[PDB]
Structure 1
């Protein structure tokens, strides 16, 4: 009924959308992994009379449900998708997207890691993102590579029309006490990568984490703090 939807409010398999700004939504789904249930976010950005999708809904069936939810709530076709790193909460569902007419994209780093891990592989490579601090335009967003953080390949997404920063899994929600699933992370570089985000996007008004509730710019400093303390 209007609050940001939480893990226990979304059965696995169902997807909700949340309006962030004009022409910007998040998508929220839930999935089981190693015997626990987790929420995860992605982004939808209006691109004229089409939509740009950022990240899958963490699985094939969830991603089919995402497409259905978009059709019901928005009614514009998803034509392109970008995955912001190689884990299943970002690429699981890419095969569904591709068979629904969506062109799927990721950095070459993400594509290599997805292939090596046995995850679904976006079709198209995003060049121009291989060095930390690189940025490229992609439709109505800017893609930014901040350096290694949650993963070595993680990208962030900025929506300049709305000053929305989608941090993906490099950014944690304010309630987080932990750095999340750090198995592929660089805890030592992560603060430095967050500082790059902070420097590059000082006018962000909304910051959306990979998992959990959006907030403001404080999510960035909180993330740095949680990661340093985890390392400690």
Structure 2
């Protein structure tokens, strides 16, 4: 009823939307992985009379439910989607999107990693993002490659009309106590990549993590802190 929805508030297979700003929503879904349930976020951005989707809802059935929720709550067609790295919480559901008429995009790095790991593969490659600090425009957003962090391919998304920074899984929520799933991470470079985000988007008003609650710019510094401490404990 208005609060940001949480993991215990969304059954696996349902999707919620949350209004972030004019023409900007997050999507929230839950999924089981190795015997535990986790929430995950994505983004929806109005693109005239169409919508741009950032990230799947972590699975085929979740992503079909996402499309149905968009049709119910917004009623504009999703025409393009961008996946911000190669893990299943970002690309799982790309086949559902593609069969629904959505054009799917990711960096060449993401596409190669998804293919090699057996995850679903976005159709179109996003050039111009291969060096840290690179940025390109994509409809109503800017895509930014900050460097290796949660994964070597992770991208961040900025919505300039609303000063919304979607960090994806390179950014953690304020309540986080560790750096999440670090299987494919570069803990040594992650603080430098977060610093690049901070320097590139100093006017961000809302920061959305890949999992958990949005907040303000403090999510970036908190992420650097938890990552350094993870490496320090380990």
What TM-score bracket applies, with the shorter chain setting the length? over 0.9
SS at match of 2:142: strand
SS at match of 2:57: coil
Moved over 2 A (4+): none
How high is the TM-score relative to the length of structure 2? 0.99
How high is the TM-score relative to the length of structure 1? 1.00
TM-align CA RMSD: 0.1
Question: Cα deviation per residue 1:5-26 (whole Å; 9 max; x = unaligned)?
Answer: 0000000000000000000000
SS at match of 2:181: coil
Once the two structures are TM-superposed, the CA of residue 102 in structure 1 deviates from its matched residue by 0.1
Structure 1 gap ranges (5+): none
Question: Cα deviation per residue 1:90-146 (whole Å; 9 max; x = unaligned)?
Answer: 000000000000000000000000000000000000000000000000000000000
Match of 1:160 in 2: 160
Structure 2 gap ranges (5+): none
Question: Cα deviation per residue 1:150-199 (whole Å; 9 max; x = unaligned)?
Answer: 00000000000000000000000000001000000000000000000000
Once the two structures are TM-superposed, the CA of residue 148 in structure 1 deviates from its matched residue by 0.1
Find the aligned partners of 2:122 and 2:192 in 1 and give their Cα distance: 28
Question: Cα deviation per residue 1:21-69 (whole Å; 9 max; x = unaligned)?
Answer: 0000000000000000000000000000000000000000000000000
Find the aligned partners of 1:180 and 1:173 in 2 and give their Cα distance: 10
Find the aligned partners of 1:91 and 1:51 in 2 and give their Cα distance: 18
